[PDB]
Structure 1
Amino acid sequence: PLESQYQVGPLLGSGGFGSVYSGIRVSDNLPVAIKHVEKDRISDWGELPTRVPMEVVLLKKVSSGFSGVIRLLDWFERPDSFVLILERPEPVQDLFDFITERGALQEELARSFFWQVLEAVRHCHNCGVLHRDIKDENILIDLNRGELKLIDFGSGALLKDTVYTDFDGTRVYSPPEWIRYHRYHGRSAAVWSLGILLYDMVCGDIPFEHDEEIIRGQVFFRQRVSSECQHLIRWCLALRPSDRPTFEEIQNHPWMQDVLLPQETAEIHLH
């Protein structure tokens, strides 16, 4: 019934995540995204009360209620692929393209965006999900509402308190303990990736490209950035996992005070 229930539109993008198309739910005209993944390229499987990709398990765990995560609406199995039906904000732009187009973000805008990402990541952790690929390309902006939404749980895992020794996320957002030892814990690795993201936001590019820079952990600013924002970044990017802030500590940091709500953010910065 997939073919009769959704009208397929243009291809939005393709990559390690598969191929994603614009779609409309025929029942009520709801904008959707339709994501196809070949079965042979699914390395990571889990189970429902049947055998599904882990991405479906993780999405179901985070798609209850409202959150800053793009929600799984339905899924289908085909003989050689799985098809996922996801929310699609309209109009929308991913944060990578937004930053590529507009350059380094004003701190007020970065503060609003970063705050929303923190809230979304807390939501995932609350639901027992570790994203493991937090980055600009996995954040969508609802341009009218100023609301950010996390995508792509394809490298994610169940959250646990023991060590992870596997990683299939983005290397330049990966922490020094992974580079050096192939070992990390969930929350502290997530905080590292958040430091990279925040730098990316306020500087318009990522801080490290090579392994040696990651391991050295020295952050240089190319752009004028406030002392308070530089401090938070350097704290998230502490070389020792135990020296990094908790999410609570990030959200109580001086730089994170007086965040704009999403709608005000869109009025000032996006309209």
Structure 2
Amino acid sequence: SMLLSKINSLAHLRASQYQVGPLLGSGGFGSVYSGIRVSDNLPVAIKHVEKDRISDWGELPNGTRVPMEVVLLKKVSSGFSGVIRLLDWFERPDSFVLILERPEPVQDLFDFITERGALQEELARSFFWQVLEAVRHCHNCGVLHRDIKDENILIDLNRGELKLIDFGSGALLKDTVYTDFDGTRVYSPPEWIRYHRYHGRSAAVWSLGILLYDMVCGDIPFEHDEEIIGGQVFFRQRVSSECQHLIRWCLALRPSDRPTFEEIQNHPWMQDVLLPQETAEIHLH
């Protein structure tokens, strides 16, 4: 179908280009469709955002009123990185339309883990390193993602490159305390469960601990609030002592006890990371 200005642009005798196909393959209910930029046949993802469901608005360099999601995407879509770039957007009477990159072939990290189970530590190290670099990029651009998880990471299977998606829960980065959070219970950091307060960078490091465990174990470590605040990590799979050490450090109960990004990337487990193309050749081809 032709992407037109409005859903009802053809409703009357009175009358880049994008072609739109079906919903992108999903067991969920996201409003993301397969697309093509007609000029150059570039694959895109076409995401719709319903105005009456936007809880967080902001302003562009323009000084123009858009979903916070558009503000954040524009900030991180500068240059090249492990973030899915916003290529274009426009406003409709009752929604916004976002045109995003679409690598081909692609699989999200959740489906990858379903299919392949617990990842080898060399693969987990390449993947985790790439997510750390992508999150640092977001922070340097003044953006806090607030929902880092396997479901929000795309794998570009040919290049071995990871890409963050879905800034729908994110915020402008600040160094002061946050009192709002939109994530699910099994991904809450302990300081949110106990106090409804967190700092952005230290809550991100929590989410990264959950993700590293997820990669090397094949599922997240906690189901219940009492597990999140209890301070015990059980390993169900074989994991190296140095990988266990880094996970337990990221999942410190007290935010101040969590490593900085420098301390994570200088950790013994994080030495000798593969290049993305190496990763694809050994693990994904």
Structure 2: 5+ residue runs without aligned partners? 1-15
Distance 1:194 1:173, change over 3 A: same
Q: Distance in 2 between matches of 1:15 and 1:71?
A: 23
The count of residues paired between Structure 1 and Structure 2 equals: 268
Distance 1:53 1:165, change over 3 A: same
In structure 1, the partner of 2:101 is: 87
Alignment of 1:67-216 (within 5 A): 67-216=81-230
Please, what TM-score do these two structures have when normalized by structure 2? 0.92
Q: Distance in 1 between matches of 2:236 and 2:257?
A: 25
Between 1:199-208 and 1:9-18, the stretch displaced more is 9-18
Deviation per residue, 1:195-229 (Å, 9 max, x gap):
00000000000000001100102100000000000
* Residues 17 and 37 in structure 1, CA contact (< 8 A), matched pair in contact too: no
Distance 1:196 1:169, change over 3 A: same
* Residues 14 and 20 in structure 1, CA contact (< 8 A), matched pair in contact too: no
Distance 1:133 1:238, change over 3 A: same
Q: Distance in 2 between matches of 1:156 and 1:15?
A: 23
Q: Distance in 2 between matches of 1:189 and 1:174?
A: 9
* Deviation for aligned residue 1:187: 0.4
Percent identity of equivalent pairs: 100
Q: Distance in 2 between matches of 1:217 and 1:57?
A: 36
* Deviation for aligned residue 1:15: 9.5
Distance 1:62 1:15, change over 3 A: farther
Matched residue of 2:25: which SS?
A: strand
Q: Distance in 1 between matches of 2:30 and 2:231?
A: 33
Structure 1: 5+ residue runs without aligned partners? none
Q: Distance in 2 between matches of 1:123 and 1:169?
A: 21
Deviation per residue, 1:173-204 (Å, 9 max, x gap):
22000000000000000000000000000000
Q: Distance in 1 between matches of 2:39 and 2:231?
A: 52
Q: Distance in 2 between matches of 1:9 and 1:218?
A: 47
Deviation per residue, 1:24-73 (Å, 9 max, x gap):
10011111000011110111100124210000000000000001000000
In structure 1, the partner of 2:259 is: 245
Q: Distance in 2 between matches of 1:26 and 1:5?
A: 5
Q: Distance in 1 between matches of 2:130 and 2:218?
A: 18
* Deviation for aligned residue 1:17: 8.4
Q: Distance in 1 between matches of 2:147 and 2:29?
A: 12
* Residues 13 and 19 in structure 1, CA contact (< 8 A), matched pair in contact too: no
* Deviation for aligned residue 1:265: 0.3
